[PDB]
Design a protein around this ligand. Sequence first.
Ligand SMILES: Nc1ncnc2c1ncn2[C@@H]1O[C@H](COP(=O)(O)OP(=O)(O)NP(=O)(O)O)[C@@H](O)[C@H]1O
Ligand SMILES: [Mg+2]
Lengths: 457, 98, 49, 98, 44, 49
Amino acid sequence: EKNVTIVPGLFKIFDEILVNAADNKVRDPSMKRIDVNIHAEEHTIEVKNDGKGIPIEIHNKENIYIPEMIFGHLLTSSNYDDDEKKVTGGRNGYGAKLCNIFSTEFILETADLNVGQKYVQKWENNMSICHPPKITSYKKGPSYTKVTFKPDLTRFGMKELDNDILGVMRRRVYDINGSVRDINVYLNGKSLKIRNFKNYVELYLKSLIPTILYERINNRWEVAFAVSDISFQQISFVNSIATTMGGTHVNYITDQIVKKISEILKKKKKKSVKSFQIKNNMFIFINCLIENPAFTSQTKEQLTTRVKDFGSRCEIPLEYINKIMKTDLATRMFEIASRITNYPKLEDANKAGTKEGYKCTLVLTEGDSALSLAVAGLAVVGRDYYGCYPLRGKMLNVREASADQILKNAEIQAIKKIMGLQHRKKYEDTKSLRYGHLMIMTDQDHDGSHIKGLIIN
Amino acid sequence: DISFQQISFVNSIATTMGGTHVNYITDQIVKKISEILKKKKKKSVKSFQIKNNMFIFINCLIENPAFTSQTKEQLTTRVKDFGSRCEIPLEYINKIMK
Amino acid sequence: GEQSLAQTIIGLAQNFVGSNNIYLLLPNGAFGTRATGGKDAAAARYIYT
Amino acid sequence: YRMYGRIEQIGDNVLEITELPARTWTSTIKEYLLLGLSGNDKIKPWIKDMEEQHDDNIKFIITLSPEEMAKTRKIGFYERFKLISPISLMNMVAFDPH
Amino acid sequence: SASDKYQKISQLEHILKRPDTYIGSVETQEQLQWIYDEETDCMI
Amino acid sequence: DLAFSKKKADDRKEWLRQYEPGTVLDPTLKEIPISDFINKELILFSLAD
DNA sequence: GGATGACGATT
DNA sequence: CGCGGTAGCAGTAGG
DNA sequence: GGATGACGATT
DNA sequence: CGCGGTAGCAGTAGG
Ligand SMILES: Nc1ncnc2c1ncn2[C@@H]1O[C@H](COP(=O)(O)OP(=O)(O)NP(=O)(O)O)[C@@H](O)[C@H]1O
Ligand SMILES: [Mg+2]
């Protein structure tokens, strides 16, 4: 984790091209390789992917080449029919064009083995200039799609691609390697090594019973858990889309782990903690595949697709929860883990605080000896109008005492709650109190006199 | 009662999800409290434990605001572009502490 | 420890229903009540026997 | 052996406990009745009112709702008010003269 | 077939097809909401 | 386990029945077998209990 | 420049 | 087996 | 059907 | 003034 300063827009248009290459693995499972070449010096970025490419063919309705149609015109996508439940990232048909629009230069190059042709077309000046595509014969070669763009840095308020934006883009490439299944990603001709989402989650090991708890719940859900240091943290992926703000999916997972834990902590011992205290001691990693997802914006940072529309469910097992309970998170929650129930010793007068609050009398006693005597006296003077509470010891001199020291003294507070006492205004009548009379029972020794003095004070 | 809650308004827009403005306010009240709790006695609590015991009402006017979507549920306009600042006074914090 | 012994004595003295059919020592003070099974009792410096 | 206290019906929907099984302390039955009065996280309240009138003897005055009267009749007065305790002579161990 | 897979829609058509980014989900949603109770004259 | 397994109470009854007075650990050995420590010293404690 | 704490016989 | 709370005064030390 | 707790002399 | 921890056994009660 490093403090950085980046232009989100720039980072996003780069994400739009990555997510497009990752979508192609869903399209053609035979894909194996994705290249990401950042030439910082030339402010140029290249994203190449093998497998099936872009059909080089004239669209029967738009009367232009398909590449020119889906990369040069807004609102163009293959994800417009929702009858077919797809797990692609593409949903709205903006992201290619949104990269083009932000770019001083944008070039599409694709090889179609069906027509045996190579297709290259260049846009310039924020997709306002559209050069005719150069089409050549392409025989005995692999099909591929290569997107190369030069960001309009002047619009992003940057003179060059500084270390901060670079460091982030690179980490977004490691994301793809981890979130996508059965592919090999290369950063400037260098293999990224990681092979599955577990390999990915373990990259955070050194920053973070083990330290990382991973599992695969099913064909569409992968969950990892670690104990957070300061507050709740999440790194999730919906169809290889970095959902950095979370959403319905994240909550769907966390709402379980928090629910089940709370029952376990509560069941074993009383006083179980508030939900937020459990959640904010978690680090949650999520890699899932949602059918035709929906987001808050085109950036797709926050999923909103209701759980019942996920196209699959993820039931967090009990075994998983019992392992989380083996980490520091548990020992953490254990650390946090009219009548009056607040004070056991208190023999509350039957009528106390009631319409006869003024009649009843509370008897404060010096020590449990005096207390025992008083409670014995109840058996003679009746409970209805008489209670008793034992003063611990020498009472706290309230004057020349900090408000905090007074607030902290459980003994004065107990008194204030039993008598129904507040400082506000000037006391005119007892009427507002639980008790209307206060009786002092001290051993009749000098120290007793002192106690009386402290009470009066 | 249970956790952090917020009811905010950016130019009569019900920003139900919060954003930069809400955080701008809460990040202060949480910061100043933490120092006060920490300063007086050792062991002061994690930020989230303070925040999640607050209910915050906010009614503000931001110059040419920007949101996450057309629905405008979440403000994203950086604090330095608010067109005005809100400095939460110490007197206010000492009342929350009451 | 003298504490345990003091408690032994108090136990020998207790006179609340349900304690000693015949208390060999007399509970001259708050030697506990039936309210908590003698646990209420007062400290040794208080009661006599 | 079995050891019974004493519960008696002194009015319409009103019971009175004058005796508890020996070694059954007053505070135990007190907490029990308080739980029955103010309900619980795991159990619903089944007692309408409760008062203590102990002299040199045990007095518990309890007021139930008619429903709880029938129900308690089904459960058994002594069985529901914890007024039954077992005495076991099966474990009588001591050092013989030798 | 390659002309049925790739579609181009108008802005008015995208709004009615994918309302979420414009006005929010058109599906019913379980929520915890504040309401005005005319009977008690207060929020609830 | 014979000594600290709650499940073995009777086992300990018999265990105490077995012990022979005068059976104590060698004052000068500088090597204490655990079994012997349990059958020569701890057992004394139990008896006292 | 105000606050907190040490010391000691007693609760 | 062990830990904790309070009064009361004079002066020192800590932020 | 396994767990927790009461009781009491001692740490 | 006051609170808390542990052993050791038999059986009962609570979920
Ligand atoms: N490298 C590629 N290989 C195959 N098809 C592609 C590739 N890049 C883009 N496309 C297609 O071109 C269309 C437009 O891309 P794009 O503008 O990103 O829309 P989208 O990804 O489907 N929706 P969104 O992700 O929200 O922007 C998509 O439907 C893709 O199917
Ligand atoms: Mg895309």
